[PDB]
């Protein structure tokens with residue numbers, strides 16, 4: 001209940017959708033690299049363990 | 053456009069041993085001993101859960117080679133119990149089972165991977181949530197780019213965790229070479245030992261979600277099951293043997309992380325290897341569950357229970373992108389849970405009730421429709437033994453926990469509103485249909501996905 005392969009490639013191959021899809025891909029991937037930078041910051045900022 | 057078959061026997065064994073071996077043998081060895089009281093009963097429930105898993109898994113090899121649809125337990129339930137029972141089954145797995153179990157093994161990945169930066173204090177909770185999320189996101193992205201990536205990742209980490217379990221068993225053998233049963237025996241309590249043990253075997257049914265993606269299912273599905281679960285059972289009883297050679301009962305009952313104490317004792321300056329391998333053991337299971345979970349929802353959308361976009365495929369890569377992006381996002385919502393490990397009781401109740409219904413169905417369908425082909429057939433005793441066993445486990449644990457099980461049934465019954473609205477009663481103003489269509493084609497345009505064919 002949607003576009004066929006034929007109907008999709010006739011619309012979603014437009015340069016506006018190609019640039020949008022590139023933007024979403026890089027937005028996600030920089031977002032994941034940001035979330036890892038966030039975790040690496042917390043792991044440095046956290047109080048280190050008492051020695052034994 | 054439809055998904056290519058490319059799971060070999062070896063990649064199917066890697067799916068099962070990779071997805072089962074998981075976290076349970078590192079995070080739950082204390083869990084059985086706290087209910088079983090002594091090593092002689094604790095090391096026995098580890099074998100008993102192995103047996104119940106083996107006979108249930110062989111039973112799934114009969115049922116799977118019979119019906120041969122993907123979507124596993126859900127598909128096999130639809131062919132016997134029909135539309136509403138199968139939808140409630142899938143609605144429980146959509147809302148709670150496959151999200152929560154993925155977030156559970158992701159939190160264990162984060163915790164044990166970070167543990168050598170914080171030995172002998174709690175690991176920072178917010179970093180343990182982020183690294184749980186980073187794992188799920190990266191394995192969703194890998195699983196979207198290529199099944200020949202995700203299966204090689206499964207092979208890689210299925211190997212890694214068996215090497216780690218080999219070290220643990222070997223150090224056990226070294227120790228007993230170098231050189232008893234005070235037990236709280238109660239049928240109302242030993243059941244929670246079993247429910248703790250079985251969580252560590254959960255996953256024998258997972259290869260049944262990819263039968264339409266293996267290269268030769270009538271050989272490789274029943275072979276991958278019976279190669280895999282004896283290996284798992286052996287590794288688990290020998291691993292527990294190792295822990296009980298190294299530690300006292302009072303240590304294992306009071307320590308937060310049994311494999312870390314085992315590492316500390318045997319390896320000293322080199323002890324960080326055991327935490328990291330418990331990490332890598334969980335990581336492999338997040339992959340195996342994202343793999344098999346996405347295929348379940350894809351089937352549930354194909355056979356009309358779940359909104360249409362989830363059935364679609366990205367045609368250049370042949371990966372079920374909308375289903376993976378959904379099961380991923382649905383897993384990250386469990387980050388808003390405090391005592392998430394509580395959900396292992398709900399997981400244990402809901403899972404073996406669904407397997408019970410499936411195996412009741414296995415007998416019922418073999419009597420009701422005997423003309424359907426049986427490329428492997430094993431026995432009529434193993435189904436009966438598994439049904440009376442699992443119904444015992446359900447009835448007795450329910451009897452001991454009515455307050456918890458009662459609210460549990462409201463999760464089940466929450467499906468009927470959604471079922472009637474979406475599947476059957478079908479409230480249908482033409483603006484709603486125009487909106488659902490518009491939303492679906494918008495999602496197609498973003499992800500570049502086309503519906504499944506022939």
Ligand SMILES: CC(C)CCC[C@@H](C)[C@H]1CC[C@H]2[C@@H]3CC=C4C[C@@H](O)CC[C@]4(C)[C@H]3CC[C@]12C
Nearest residue numbers: 028031032035178181182185189384385387388
């Ligand atoms: C990086 C982006 C693109 C990933 C896509 C999903 C985004 C939108 C959302 C969905 C649920 C979200 C997580 C939900 C809960 C928590 C717990 C909190 O204590 C830290 C942030 C964290 C871990 C969130 C991070 C961002 C998150 C993963």
Ligand SMILES: CC(C)CCC[C@@H](C)[C@H]1CC[C@H]2[C@@H]3CC=C4C[C@@H](O)CC[C@]4(C)[C@H]3CC[C@]12C
Nearest residue numbers: 036039040041043044165169183185186187190
């Ligand atoms: C998503 C997958 C790849 C896991 C991501 C986990 C990240 C957050 C982990 C894995 C290994 C970790 C690093 C391992 C060792 C050190 C040295 C220490 O003196 C400071 C922290 C630091 C630099 C850690 C930061 C956090 C780290 C990068």
Ligand SMILES: N[C@]1(C(=O)O)C[C@@H]2CC[C@H]1C2
Nearest residue numbers: 072074075076254255337
């Ligand atoms: N076997 C599991 C494990 O990792 O121990 C338990 C949950 C079901 C599949 C995985 C997650």
